[PDB]
Amino acid sequence: QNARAFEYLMTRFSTPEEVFGPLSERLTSGYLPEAEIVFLDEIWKAGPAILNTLLTAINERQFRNGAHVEKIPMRLLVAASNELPEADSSLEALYDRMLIRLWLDKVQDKANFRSMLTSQQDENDNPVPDALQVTDEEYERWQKEIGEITLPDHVFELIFMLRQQLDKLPDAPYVSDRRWKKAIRLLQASAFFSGRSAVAPVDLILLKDCLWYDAQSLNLIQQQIDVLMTGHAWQQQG
Amino acid sequence: HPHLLAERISRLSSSLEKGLYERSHAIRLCLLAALSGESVFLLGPPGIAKSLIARRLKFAFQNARAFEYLMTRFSTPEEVFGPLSERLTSGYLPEAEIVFLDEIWKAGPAILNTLLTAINERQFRNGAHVEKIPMRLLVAASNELPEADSSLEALYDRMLIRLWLDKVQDKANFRSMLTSQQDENDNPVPDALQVTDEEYERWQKEIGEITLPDHVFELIFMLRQQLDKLPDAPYVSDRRWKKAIRLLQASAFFSGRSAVAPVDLILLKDCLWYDAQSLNLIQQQIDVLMTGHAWQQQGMLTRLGAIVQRHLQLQQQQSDKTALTVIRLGGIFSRRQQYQLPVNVTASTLTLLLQKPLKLHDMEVVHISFERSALEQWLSKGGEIRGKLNGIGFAQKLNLEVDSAQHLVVRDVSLQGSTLALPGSLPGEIKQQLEELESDWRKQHALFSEQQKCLFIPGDWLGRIEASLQDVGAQIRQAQQ
Numbered sequence: 001q002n003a004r005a006f007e008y009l010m011t012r013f014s015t016p017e018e019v020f021g022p023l024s025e026r027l028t029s030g031y032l033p034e035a036e037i038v039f040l041d042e043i044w045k046a047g048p049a050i051l052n053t054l055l056t057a058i059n060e061r062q063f064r065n066g067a068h069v070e071k072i073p074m075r076l077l078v079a080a081s082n083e084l085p086e087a088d089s090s091l092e093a094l095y096d097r098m099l100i101r102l103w104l105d106k107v108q109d110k111a112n113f114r115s116m117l118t119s120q121q122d123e124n125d126n127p128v129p130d131a132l133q134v135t136d137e138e139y140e141r142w143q144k145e146i147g148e149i150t151l152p153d154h155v156f157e158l159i160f161m162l163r164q165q166l167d168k169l170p171d172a173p174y175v176s177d178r179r180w181k182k183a184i185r186l187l188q189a190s191a192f193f194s195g196r197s198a199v200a201p202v203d204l205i206l207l208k209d210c211l212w213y214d215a216q217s218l219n220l221i222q223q224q225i226d227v228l229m230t231g232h233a234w235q236q237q238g
Numbered sequence: 239h240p241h242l243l244a245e246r247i248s249r250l251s252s253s254l255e256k257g258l259y260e261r262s263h264a265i266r267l268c269l270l271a272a273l274s275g276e277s278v279f280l281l282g283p284p285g286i287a288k289s290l291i292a293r294r295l296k297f298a299f300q301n302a303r304a305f306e307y308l309m310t311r312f313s314t315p316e317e318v319f320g321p322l323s324e325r326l327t328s329g330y331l332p333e334a335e336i337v338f339l340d341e342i343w344k345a346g347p348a349i350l351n352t353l354l355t356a357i358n359e360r361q362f363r364n365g366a367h368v369e370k371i372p373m374r375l376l377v378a379a380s381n382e383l384p385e386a387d388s389s390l391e392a393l394y395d396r397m398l399i400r401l402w403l404d405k406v407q408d409k410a411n412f413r414s415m416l417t418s419q420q421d422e423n424d425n426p427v428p429d430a431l432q433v434t435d436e437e438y439e440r441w442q443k444e445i446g447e448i449t450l451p452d453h454v455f456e457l458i459f460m461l462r463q464q465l466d467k468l469p470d471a472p473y474v475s476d477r478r479w480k481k482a483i484r485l486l487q488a489s490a491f492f493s494g495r496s497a498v499a500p501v502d503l504i505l506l507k508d509c510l511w512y513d514a515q516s517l518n519l520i521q522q523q524i525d526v527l528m529t530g531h532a533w534q535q536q537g538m539l540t541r542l543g544a545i546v547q548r549h550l551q552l553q554q555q556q557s558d559k560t561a562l563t564v565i566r567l568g569g570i571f572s573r574r575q576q577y578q579l580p581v582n583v584t585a586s587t588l589t590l591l592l593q594k595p596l597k598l599h600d601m602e603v604v605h606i607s608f609e610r611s612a613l614e615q616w617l618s619k620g621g622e623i624r625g626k627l628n629g630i631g632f633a634q635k636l637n638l639e640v641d642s643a644q645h646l647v648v649r650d651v652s653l654q655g656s657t658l659a660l661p662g663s664l665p666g667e668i669k670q671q672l673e674e675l676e677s678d679w680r681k682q683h684a685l686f687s688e689q690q691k692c693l694f695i696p697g698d699w700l701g702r703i704e705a706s707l708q709d710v711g712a713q714i715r716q717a718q719q
């Protein structure tokens with residue numbers, strides 16, 4: 001009911017004044033410090049000062065607005081690109097902090113391409129009804145009830161086992177401790193909006209887009225989880 | 239008054255630990271360096287809680303500011319110390335207290351040049367006049383190591399504490415860590431445990447007033463000469479030895495002490511090494527020093543040997559009263575058997591006395607000491623005996639055989655006879671000198687049983703110190719039996 005958009009393209013010669021609003025103390029009228037859902041395309045080529053300001057707006061939800069600081073009501077942070085960053089660069093600090101790594105691709109099915117090729121639905125209207133939109137009061141209350149989800153003993157036996165399996169495989173990517181803590185908030189939120197009070201074992205499917213980092217480790221993460229979900233989840237291989 | 243200071247620090251570090259498991263060695267080391275004006279370095283993979291410790295120690299004070307910046311390959315000094323108009327340093331580093339600099343091994347050339355003047359002088363140039371920086375804690379984290387021939391080594395050699403963090407390994411400490419409800423942006427430190435600005439300026443002057451005992455200097459100078467003789471040991475500059483004293487004097491200040499304690503030398507395990515190769519060498523030399531010359535472990539070993547030498551000297555003169563005799567079992571059996579003293583020696587290493595001394599291994603000997611759990615091997619399997627001499631050295635090969643009268647005749651290079659015997663089952667001269675050395679062990683043990691409550695000491699080091707003190711005490715109680 002109170003969301004704003006911000007579609008910006010990061011270039012090799014971009015300046016922080018053209019992103020967070022130019023100063024006069026900074027004219028942040030509809031940009032990022034007061035926005036909710038911002039879009040950043042081609043993030044792997046911005047300036048050095050642009051990436052440094054984005055790290056403080058994630059762990060603290062604040063911004064250095066000259067003298068006094070202020071909070072940022074950022075609810076969703078999305079970023080898209082095409083290529084991959086270097087192996088020894090400063091751009092890996094933001095990639096290791098992002099949770100979900102969606103892997104989109106072009107369409108392949110023929111039945112779903114007929115209506116998609118000739119679609120009359122507008123992409124700038126409001127297809128969401130006014131009765132299905134949440135208010136600002138319900139958002140602040142839901143941020144606290146997610147952490148109250150209990151962790152069953154059977155769920156912990158699969159998280160610790162998957163961590164030890166990737167450590168023994170040399171070709172498996174390294175997963176930091178921050179990724180394991182942030183992934184629980186995603187699984188607990190999935191069972192919260194599904195009519196459950198505890199962490200469901202089926203929620204481990206979403207971990208296929210939170211462990212890999214390149215195209216080489218994409219076929220390894222989706223393979224170990226497929227065996228885990230069809231082996232030790234509901235005691236398949238057991 | 240000094241005794242109540244150690245209790246206030248123990249309650250301050252307890253609230254800082256809430257939220258970060260298996261990180262007690264990293265928070266306690268940053269708290270002591272912040273109250274003494276020292277730096278700290280962290281190394282490890284990105285994602286092992288390296289930036290939160292810089293934002294957590296600021297809540298333990300009353301006027302602290304945070305500064306989390308990431309140094310890049312194209313970073314400029316104007317974006318770190320504030321742009322100029324004379325420089326707008328509103329909330330950056332010249333007026334901050336605890337700053338955080340991640341990936342410091344890739345900044346610009348002018349960035350590192352300004353960080354060197356803000357450490358030795360605590361100042362920063364600003365066009366014309368200069369000003370002081372109220373910096374209290376300097377932390378820097380990264381991932382890899384710099385080059386061997388580069389300009390980045392000027393800052394690494396100046397940092398004192400080199401923390402070695404790593405990912406979690408324990409399973410019990412990972413359950414509550416995986417699902418933690420503690421916020422990382424609140425104020426878990428109470429208002430009563432936060433020091434003021436007046437108490438900080440007063441503590442910085444009382445650290446230098448800590449006296450240096452004469453026994454403590456014997457351990458620092460010995461460690462410096464030991465690392466110089468080892469080619470694989472890392473080089474330690476003279477600046478590191480001077481800056482390490484401020485860390486040890488600050489540990490005893492917040493622990494209820496007025497002098498430098500020998501137990502404070504444990505913190506030197508993270509202030510000498512520089513890479514992963516020298517990490518296992520520094521922790522090995524200190525472990526031997528703390529269990530050898532700290533509380534006079536080996537110092538009493540060279541003194542107890544002189545008492546045993548004087549005691550065995552008066553016992554070998556009257557060894558003609560009772561000698562050694564091995565049985566000659568036969569009846570219905572082949573070769574006879576050979577053994578040693580029974581319950582008369584209740585130890586794994588028994589001693590033997592000889593009458594006529596000989597020259598074995600181009601040296602004189604007054605008593606032959608064998609192993610109780612190893613002498614039966616040669617006496618049953620046969621071959622060549624392996625025993626030490628004078629209670630020292632390795633198991634040398636001697637020329638021992640069986641005599642017609644069952645006597646351990648130790649032969650040499652001249653085919654000379656030497657019948658071994660046993661000491662008698664305590665003179666007044668030996669007992670008087672033994673009580674003087676035994677009383678010294680109780681004085682050294684009483685010091686460890688009073689200062690072990692230091693919060694800035696890891697728990698795994700107390701197991702090796704207690705095992706080293708009981709080993710010396712178990713040997714001094716053998717001669718008095």
Ligand SMILES: Nc1ncnc2c1ncn2[C@@H]1O[C@H](COP(=O)(O)OP(=O)(O)O)[C@@H](O)[C@H]1O
Pocket residue numbers: 177178181257258259283284285286287288289290405406415422
């Ligand atoms: N070993 C750990 N134990 C507990 N919490 C951790 C650990 N590692 C990371 N975290 C949590 O992850 C969050 C972000 O950590 P971060 O600053 O990214 O670490 P780093 O600076 O090492 O990358 C912190 O709030 C911290 O609570």
